[model samples]
Target: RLIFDADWLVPEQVQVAGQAIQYYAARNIQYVQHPVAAIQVLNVFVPAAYLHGSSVNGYQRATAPILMPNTVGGYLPGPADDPQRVTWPTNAGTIQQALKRGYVVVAAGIRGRTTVDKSGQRVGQAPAFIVDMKAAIRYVKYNQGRLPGDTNRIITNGTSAGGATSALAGASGNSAYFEPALTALGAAPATDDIFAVSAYCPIHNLEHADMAYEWQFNGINDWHRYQPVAGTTKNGRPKFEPVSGQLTVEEQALSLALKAQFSTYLNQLQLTASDGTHLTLNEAGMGSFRDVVRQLLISSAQTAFDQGTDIHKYAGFVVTGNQVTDLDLSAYLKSLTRMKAVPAFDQLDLTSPENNLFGDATAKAKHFTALAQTRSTVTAQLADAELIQAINPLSYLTTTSSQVAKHWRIRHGAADRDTSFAIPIILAIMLENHGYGIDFALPWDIPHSGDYDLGDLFSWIDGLCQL
Candidate 1:
């Protein structure tokens, strides 16, 4: 029941089937339909200049399929209640410029900011957002006399969280079950598929993300908290309320929150582990326990590599190893004894699947014994370091899809220390490894906000669409 109000600007030549189509041109603006229902809306700028001058001039124009995933501007306490009151970290001017150039722009409200579950938790899953995008695309394709949407030419784009979502949506093309909840919502259609993606400063590796970025966007140390987990009641019993399946309300919330938290935690640990200020597994009684955990991580990486899940999939462990090498585990644990901090450790939780399979204690012991039985069994089965290096999405173009197109043109602001351009550089390298064509742009004297040059973007779009 959320109502959205858009500040629309239709260019003179922008038409669908000879009839003008409406478009909103701002950020953080909300239009409320019900007392408690509201949706935050945003528009993407795809330069008409990017495409041939053949533009959708009016609502009567043929359905021009375009996909634009709305970026989540900044942190908002709840769904938007007033559009006028919302301020954007980045303006719509650049995006509007793109729209004027030739792209049939699709503006959308992100979940959590626009709509919440019946339990009122924010919806932030990448798959869920893709579902919403699919719906928007469909609306344009079939809604006669409504909007000039060419269902076939859809492209996805976003920055930051939006960028990550866009990348995932593009990567998940034709894979509809990534977010099962969205399917149960009855909004996802069978025809929903992403043609391309554009991501700017996206979160590519959730489990090993940049700590500074996590702090800036989620205000938490771990993104895994956003994922699903087992729910517990006030008395510690498992909650069984189900949203779409057998899960209870508490369970669903826990699962979502835990996933986000875990992702964030792992990312933070990976980024800062080498510094010794984070990712401490070796403690007084936890030294052995920590070693066990390390071994488990290695085993998981080895197993995934063996199963062909992607080599960069094991990058988290590599980063973790680098961090561990910086620490004097024996000395650090010994110092705890001098400080009289040693205590008896509780038995490890071997029943939990993660504990049994990926946990440090269980996997290390199991792998240790297996290796002892036959050195060749473990030695020959190790993950190839070269293969691991080759799996980076930025290393090769094969990993690039229309959805990941945004990553190609992103230019971080020079002054924005909160984010490192290094990530994109690495990602680009990964894409290159897969033999994809790519170009990187760096605008001088710009911060995160300043790097977005509308004029430059239009020119780039023009060059791309000609291809």
Candidate 2:
């Protein structure tokens, strides 16, 4: 049965990036929930003029792209992020940019790690978030004929945990494992596959994030430097804090060991570039992969130079009057300090947000990784192993799933060490390996942010939809 009440939507005008855009605001449209999640609702913004066949900026929006944007971070639980609030890559928000560009924005209020049931026990866990979003996609697609936008061109977007979920949705579509949950919530009897994905600074692949973090940030001992932690000092002035960069000797040893384990994993991936050049990691940690990473950094630095940021200001970069060249990977990491301590994810003491994400039946945090389990101060009993596979996007990417998105756009700042670049790089390559369109880039000097280049993002979506 169709659960949506059409009468729920009301006409409203929203100011997006200084433009008063007329749209219909549909709040709290339940996607699916028997007991109800912390907030399992969908808020859709439809262009007012698109009701007819009038164009939005010379483009026909009767069949505009459906932008499904999610905001999840640090694996910390929260309700739907504020649509009118300011977003990263600042001076403008994501929904504002999408709405201003005449795209139909459908944001969901999915459950997360902190959700509690009537029994006062944690309810929403690993697979819960993914299942809810997939159900949302199914709901939207199920009602394509009645909905206001073209469901065919659904584009998923997110940052960090949001990016992780977006990537998961992109990689795993209509997989049967999630069907039980989807059906339980009364999801639409339709496919949940997406057309394209846009992920920024995706902090995911929890199973391997620790090793990858050590792989990229090991040997860089400095802890005082990094992108400024953004916040207002109580005095109403700009404020920044130096990273503690704190780690014990034992912790340092553990991180070093984890770094060693990464190369073996990298070699097994057998990822190749667009030109069909096989990427390899050496015993030195980055064999042929070093050149590829360096080239990407140089490209970002050159682009930043083009954008009027002096490349000479940063280390390991050579500025020749205007063009910057010659970057050293080791020097770069050394210059920027590590934000999190050793074992970034799957914390030993059940303190990390991701720890809470992979909680046990008791609703208390647990170690999700083998190493963390061994060293954890809390009970060594690991999180449900099956949930581990469910949360990881890679679990579905390597399979022969026909429901996967055809195109992916993965981006990370060259200087953002929030998580290793390895996560997104390998993700895109895996998709590319199976013959998918990818537009992956490492923008210069951007730090743990999203939607910096909305123009390029939407243009790619437009191109894909046109196809």
Candidate 3:
């Protein structure tokens, strides 16, 4: 009947670093009727305070915040978080921190881009991830009174591609675009609005990500990455070897072309920085946009220097009186390293995970970008425009019809090369211009990872939800 059973949970106590933590656990709760895949269920964990009327870290069961964390990475399906299978020391993981801080945790399993049936029929593709997320949210909202935490105070957190999912879910809340899919799944009749979002190294803006990547590494042709070798290590893990090279003349020309297209996209976005300057680019793709990026790098470098890092060790940065006043942009980018090839997201060869993400029932991998569609090296079909818009947070964040979350925490590491820095920069700037609460930064020397700064994350949450 798609109704929440309040008595379905079992009480559990787990020892972590010698502290006995108690919580109520519910596993494999199907969020929707007529589920398509086994990864469509969710698991809920409520702090023990729900029974005794006690408080942890100043939050009670009556008003506790909910933490919904998705385990998606590389556009692959993830199982629901089983608390019994988790092992973490005191200083790691979002689930552990949120649980001990009196926050109810909802770890929902989500279908990714690559799920298939026994007959080899493509099931999970673009927008399915977002649809499943919205359904799970509706499940929570449907059981508002039956749940321990406040439905109005729900927060979503994830990393990498999951970060994109978290941000898009929060941005597209209560929008009617997902109505048909939600109805098809028989999702609960409730709004999917969220209170806040926390995304780390989100690889979003998929359609424009290729141009953005080129803009970040236009003239730099040298590429280096570690790929898995033929055999596995003694520990049964895949072993990797380093591969490095420069782009060919044809590839280098394509890089410049993609880089040139970025200025138009940047200008059309019309994002405003905190200082009221409209961030724009010239025809040559160098102006206020590059200026904003330069300032972001300066801030990141200065933060690292203040944290005992020797700024003088880096050749380009001009550090005077322990302040990083200036830096050579080219020198800084060269050191950060460009990991991807010419077209980052929509590869001309139809090989990237993002290409497969936009696939329809007919084709397993299709081009999502118009440039990639026209210039594809392989015979690939173009994805539906609606599906592309459905997965991007930028499509709904500026629209008033969508009930976007008020608070956001977006962190892209300083050395992260998974996607361009412009993705998060433009996202944060647009949110700030719209007057949303944004805690955005490029953490010092971190790389394409998440949950490294939980203390600051929880502090921000506590500031927002404190009574």
Candidate 4:
């Protein structure tokens, strides 16, 4: 069951025409729960005004009530697990300013954070967080009539992770993951694309994160150590050598067995008396045992054989036959004979500079230097006179560009840890690129807190009404 406790504050004042005006501030406190879901409570505050002019003239106002949505959606840090012990900042200061301008203020509690699942898992990821927000938006649009919320002009403002979610909700535009009832509204299934968005210190990429600090804070730095590795040693084998620098008796036995298997495999490849009958010069049947040894050396660690001068030294040690003075030449030729299948390797000459591996430091350095020079030349050409005047997004805004939407304001706090100040900057740039009039505010000394400068925001909101 979902229940809400509503409260109001009425302020009486004399108007310009000497008539009594009544200002109303209403707040609704409610909690919601669902199946396969968690409990979430929303703290909604709505403020309105009714002005009376004079006895001779009726009261008339220039603007209707405005509704502002701020993201303070969920749980606050507390000393214990108890919800009652949790202390949250009350009625954001900015919400109070909105009331003076006759604007309704709404805030919600994100699911999974305020309450846990039946199995005791905290909600921290997507789908759940975004879904709850969408439901809150619907509630405001349908139920809070006196707040005078413009269903189409509702803007979402948040910081850091909340800001990222707000941006996602904006860009997600009518996607099923956010809003399920969009189809019923004759719209696509997704969160309503907000008219404007304000974010500070938002997270953009989660997958390829350089989360070294976060890992330490979460106390899961060695989590990967618990994962299993294929072909790693198990019982009776030394998976990790002892700090005492000695192998256990069982590990020594396993090492001997591994070496025996290697010896047996090598023996089977050598031409013996039984296999000698199968060797015929006309068919080039097994050729010399040296040829087999050369083939093995070439196939295994080809790079080492190509670069190192001690190829014959190692090849001679492995071959059982008598050492021949021209064994080096014979071994090299045998390796080249098998190289007929590889065209790329064939291009290399043993004596030339190009004969080295493709990724060798010398070759890579040369390639990168050449690429850098070419890039610089191209960039210089683009910077030449007349080329800088080319029509682009930035240029379009300065000349012959028309505004697509009404006056838009983006507010972000500099000290916010969640959404960086860059988010609102980027959005402002995007709007400006498209030739839109955008006011971007970066408030100082405020941590993810948005209510710090209600006066400036109220002025902007008043400006919007004039438009």
Top-scoring candidate (lDDT): 3
Q: Write model 2 residue lDDT over 139-191, tens digit each, in one string.
A: 88988856777888899888888889898898888888888878788777889
lDDT of 4 by residue, 1-467 (tens): 23222333333332423533334433333323333333344444332333232111111232343243434332211111111111332334344444445554455555433334577544422344555555655554444343344455555655444554454444443443333432222321223444554443444322111121121112111111122234335322224321212333543343333223323322332323333432111121123432433333333324334445333433322433332223342333222221011011111122111121111212211111121223232222111111122111122233432222334555554333232222244355555544456676544333454445556655665565543
> Can you give the TM-score per candidate against the true fold?
0.45, 0.91, 0.95, 0.42
- What does candidate 1's lDDT look like per residue over 146-224, in tens digits? 3344455566656654554455554444442433543444442335455544556663442223221222222111211
lDDT per residue (tens digit) for residues 16-107 in model 3: 66888888988899999978888899999988888688888888877899888888788877567765644211112467667888899888
Model 2: which ten-residue window has the lowest total lDDT? 83-92
- The C-alpha stretches of model 1 lying farther than 4 A from their native spots are 1-60, 63-69, 74-86, 113-115, 118-127, 134-149, 188-190, 210-408
lDDT of residue 334 for candidate 1: 24
Please count the clashing residue pairs in each candidate, in the order shown: 100, 1, 0, 16
TM-score of structure candidate 1: 0.45
How much is 258 displaced in model 2, in angstroms? 0.7
Displacement of the residue 310 alpha carbon in candidate 3, Å: 3.3
Q: List residue ranges in candidate 3 displaced over 4 A.
A: 86-92, 228-239, 274-276, 312-315
Ranking, TM-score, top scorer first: 3, 2, 1, 4
lDDT per model, in order? Answer: 0.36, 0.77, 0.85, 0.35
lDDT at residue 263 of model 3 (Cα atoms): 90
Candidate 2 lDDT (Cα, whole model)? 0.77
